[PDB]
Design a protein around this ligand. Structure first.
Ligand SMILES: *Cc1[nH]c(Cc2[nH]c(Cc3[nH]c(Cc4[nH]cc(CCC(=O)O)c4CC(=O)O)c(CCC(=O)O)c3CC(=O)O)c(CCC(=O)O)c2CC(=O)O)c(CCC(=O)O)c1CC(=O)O
Length: 345
């Protein structure tokens, strides 16, 4: 008579690990409840057909899992929160924001360079990254290094670094290496003054059907209030800038002393044009849960009716406030130019 909770996952190693970690946490709250993990790999030729824009191989993967949700083949999927756009299709929502892992970008160094930092690499060292945000910030901070795209999966990146002669280092998210059990490869954790992280980096988001109240009820136990509020602010900031996908936008948040701090910035692709500012608001981390009404609208794609709504609205307002500041200083022109340049391919 029950529902069996079907959990859809991509087939990549990191996605499978993330999915299973969320399932384990759910089973800890709901022992005996039946879960079924369903791995999906279907070639998404039909989603590219309907697209009026270039999608990209990664963005295609997210759309494929929403298709599984829409067709009632699975009941929830687990994403890195930074892979979920700030505007979701109307039938979907993020029903859980899990406790954040390390949000910072990290450096892995060529083995001859143990003990080094980007600051102490030889001039003209070649550093691999395929992220426009990382390349923009790091080119500005480190004008005497060379930042180049690097092809392949993580295992290929690390093999190229250990075996070949091109790259002195690579940049990637600390959280990915953490989840791979490979934190011992990290040689430097980048601070906001070197490289601020992507909106939502390090948090997992659970996507579900927007009106599937039974599943929303179950997964709401996963919401971490502090991570929820930080990520609402980061995503509201990004949404309100109204830039395209991918262009260089980065953030830093902290909740401390009863305050929520949000730093946000935009960069041209080469890093030479930038605007960054910090704002704060008095918001404390709620310790109580609640049973908010089903009519409450989601906030930047997130349904968290069991967490007090006042602080969520305040976090959203902080992000909007900071976006409006950046826009009054010319952020739209920086974002538009970056989008047009990145639309060349
Ligand atoms: C319009 C619009 N679209 C999107 C979806 C979207 N997100 C990104 C961010 C992204 N993702 C990755 C790959 C990655 N994902 C998770 C990890 C591990 C760390 C973690 O769990 O947080 C990784 C790898 C890693 O960082 O080490 C990257 C890295 C580059 C890559 O492999 O593709 C990034 C970019 C970055 O961090 O700077 C993207 C961009 C992907 C790209 O490289 O261009 C996209 C769009 C796409 O797939 O084309 C968003 C959400 C962005 C956000 O919230 O951060 C938006 C924003 C909007 O609505 O305005």
């Amino acid at each position: 008579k029950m529902r069996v909770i079907r959990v859809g996952t991509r087939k990549s190693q990191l996605a499978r690990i993330q999915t299973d970690s969320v399932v384990a946490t759910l089973k800890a709250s709901y022992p005996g409840l039946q879960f079924e993990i369903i791995a999906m790999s279907t070639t998404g030729d039909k989603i590219l057909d309907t697209a009026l824009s270039k999608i990209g191989e990664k963005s295609l993967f997210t759309k494929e899992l929403e298709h599984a949700l829409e067709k009632n083949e699975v009941d929830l999927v687990v994403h890195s929160l930074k892979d979920l756009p700030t505007v979701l299709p109307p039938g979907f929502t993020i029903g859980a924001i899990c406790k954040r892992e390390n949000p910072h970008d990290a450096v892995v160094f060529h083995p001859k360079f143990v003990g080094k930092t980007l600051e102490t690499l030889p001039e003209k060292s070649v550093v691999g990254t395929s992220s426009l945000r990382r390349a923009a910030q790091l080119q500005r901070k480190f004008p005497h290094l060379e930042f180049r795209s690097i092809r392949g999966n993580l295992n290929t990146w690390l093999r190229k670094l250990d075996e070949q002669q091109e790259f002195s280092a690579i940049i990637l998210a600390t959280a990915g290496l953490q989840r791979m059990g490979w934190h011992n490869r990290v040689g430097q954790i980048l601070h906001p003054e070197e490289c601020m992280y992507a909106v939502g980096q390090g948090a997992l988001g659970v996507e579900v059907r927007a009106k599937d109240q039974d599943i929303l009820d179950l997964v709401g136990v996963l919401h971490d209030p502090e991570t929820l509020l930080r990520c609402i602010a980061e995503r509201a900031f990004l949404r309100h800038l109204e830039g395209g996908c991918s262009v260089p936008v980065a953030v830093h948040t902290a909740m401390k002393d009863g305050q929520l701090y949000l730093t946000g910035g935009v960069w041209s692709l080469d890093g030479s044009d930038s605007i960054q500012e910090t704002m704060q608001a008095t918001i404390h981390v709620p310790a109580q849960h609640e049973d908010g009404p089903e009519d409450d609208p989601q906030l930047v794609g997130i349904t968290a009716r069991n967490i007090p709504r006042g602080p969520q609205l305040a976090a959203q307002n902080l992000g909007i406030s900071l976006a409006n500041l950046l826009l009054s200083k010319g952020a739209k022109n920086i974002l538009d130019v970056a989008r047009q340049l990145n639309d060349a391919h």
